Antibody
Framework: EVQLVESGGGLVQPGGSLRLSCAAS????????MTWVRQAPGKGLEWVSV???????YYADSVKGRFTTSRDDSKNTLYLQMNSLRGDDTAVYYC???????????WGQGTLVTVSSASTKGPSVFPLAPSSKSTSGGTAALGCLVKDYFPEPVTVSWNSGALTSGVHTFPAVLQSSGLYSLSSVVTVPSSSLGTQTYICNVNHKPSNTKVDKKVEPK | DILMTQSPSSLSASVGDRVTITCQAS??????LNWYQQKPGKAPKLLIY???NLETGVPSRFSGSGSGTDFSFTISSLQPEDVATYYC?????????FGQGTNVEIKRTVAAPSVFIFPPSDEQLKSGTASVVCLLNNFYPREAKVQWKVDNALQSGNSQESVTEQDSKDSTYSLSSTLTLSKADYEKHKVYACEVTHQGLSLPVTKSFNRG
């Protein structure tokens, strides 16, 4: 029903530009003041900018002179034009309408902005096969390693979404090479090994879709 | 620029326990302070506005109080779905400023980890790099110790760790330890084992594998 939707994020080069858009449904962006907030990976929240109903704009000192907030009332959409982009600007960006002293706060789901000179690299999906020492009747673990990819994120599912119980996809770890790495494990019965197909599906920002099957070793 | 001092940064409490978060302002902000709840992977959600007032739909266990410089956020009967990071934020004084955040963990009984070791696949050995993975399945508490010993020689600086968030239906954590080395170093040794130390294990459990 009532929602805010951000878009426009992506991976840009230091010194590049970007235009984030926030589409409002159920909220007239011309009547309330809208806010841009950002959150670095694994950090807290930092107020970026605000625009008032009258048209007044305010900006955090760290983005003053580079960012510009605007809105198109006919399209009912808030905009954030980000220029002279730096590495510290890498964050998830949310738009928000927090009603002043009333009820009805809404934040969008956010859009990820990555600013780096590194190029996009597709990942390599490798198996982590079930141990041959898995005894029938008990639980056995298997997974796939998604290694050497940039930037975030990657999406891992199991059996096209059919297998969700017992699945653990770990957060990505930034390797010393600057590329991210990630692993997704799942615990299945030791029985039905070889009787049930176990396949993990990996997706990425570069057009990488790996649908990898996990089997015992020999 | 008003400084927001949120405290504590972390807390652990069992289901139904009372939990209180403090947030001290560097200036008088009257009652213009909000409280946000951010569950992992989701956006922040405003729960308390104007220090005390509850947003629409928020359960009664959430409460806020305070005026001037000192404010408090209290969950009466803590529920497992309340595992999140909570932020205080002043709204009236430009620029709006947030607190450092508080991590809220539900407390449960000790659960030892199910440990698994994963040798490098044959497809990755051609990439000239071997990746050994030690998985610590659903355990509580998060505080664990994973050491890599290959050929009975302890390793350091060549391994990374990842920890999941507290589960919704388990309230447990899952850890992964990944040991990355070249193919030459991999085929120059034979025994590969990770040793895990955790409360709820009587002694450090070791899972091992030999090339073959």
């Amino acid at each position: 029903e009532v929602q805010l939707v951000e878009s426009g994020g992506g991976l840009v080069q230091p010194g590049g530009s970007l235009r984030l858009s926030c589409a409002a449904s159920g909220i007239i962006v011309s009547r309330n003041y809208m806010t841009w907030v950002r959150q670095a990976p694994g950090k807290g929240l930092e107020w970026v900018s605000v625009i008032y109903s009258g048209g007044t704009t305010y900006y955090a000192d760290s983005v003053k002179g580079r960012f510009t907030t605007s809105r198109d009332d006919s399209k009912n959409t808030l905009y954030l034009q980000m220029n002279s982009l730096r590495g510290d600007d890498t964050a998830v960006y949310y738009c928000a309408r927090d009603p002043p002293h009333r009820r009805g706060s809404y934040w969008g789901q956010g859009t990820l902005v990555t600013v780096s000179s590194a190029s996009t690299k597709g990942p390599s999906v490798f198996p982590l096969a079930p141990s041959s020492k898995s005894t029938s009747g008990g639980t056995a673990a298997l997974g796939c390693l998604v290694k050497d990819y940039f930037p975030e994120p990657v999406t891992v599912s199991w059996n096209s979404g059919a297998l969700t119980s017992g699945v653990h996809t770990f957060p990505a770890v930034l390797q010393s090479s600057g590329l991210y790495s990630l692993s997704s494990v799942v615990t299945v019965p030791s029985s039905s090994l070889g009787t049930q197909t176990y396949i993990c599906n990996v997706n990425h920002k570069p057009s990488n879709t790996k649908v990898d099957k996990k089997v015992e070793p020999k | 620029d008003i400084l927001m001092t949120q405290s504590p940064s972390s807390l652990s409490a069992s289901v139904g326990d009372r939990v209180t978060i403090t947030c001290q302002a560097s200036q008088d902000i009257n009652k213009y302070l909000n409280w946000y709840q951010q569950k992992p992977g989701k956006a922040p959600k405003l729960l308390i506005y104007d220090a005390s007032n509850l947003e629409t739909g928020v359960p009664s266990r959430f409460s806020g109080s305070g005026s001037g410089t000192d404010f408090s956020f209290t969950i009466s009967s803590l529920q497992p779905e309340d595992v999140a990071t909570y932020y205080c934020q002043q709204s009236d004084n430009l620029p709006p400023t947030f607190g450092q955040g508080t991590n809220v963990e539900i407390k449960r009984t000790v659960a030892a980890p199910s440990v698994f070791i994963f040798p490098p696949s044959d497809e990755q050995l051609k990439s000239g790099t071997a990746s050994v993975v030690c998985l610590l399945n659903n355990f509580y508490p998060r505080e664990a110790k994973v050491q890599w010993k290959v050929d009975n020689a302890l390793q350091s600086g060549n391994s990374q760790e990842s920890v999941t968030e507290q589960d919704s239906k388990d309230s447990t954590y899952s850890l992964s330890s990944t040991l990355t080395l070249s193919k030459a170093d991999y085929e120059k040794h034979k025994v590969y084992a990770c040793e895990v130390t955790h409360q709820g294990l009587s002694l450090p459990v070791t899972k091992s594998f030999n090339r073959g």
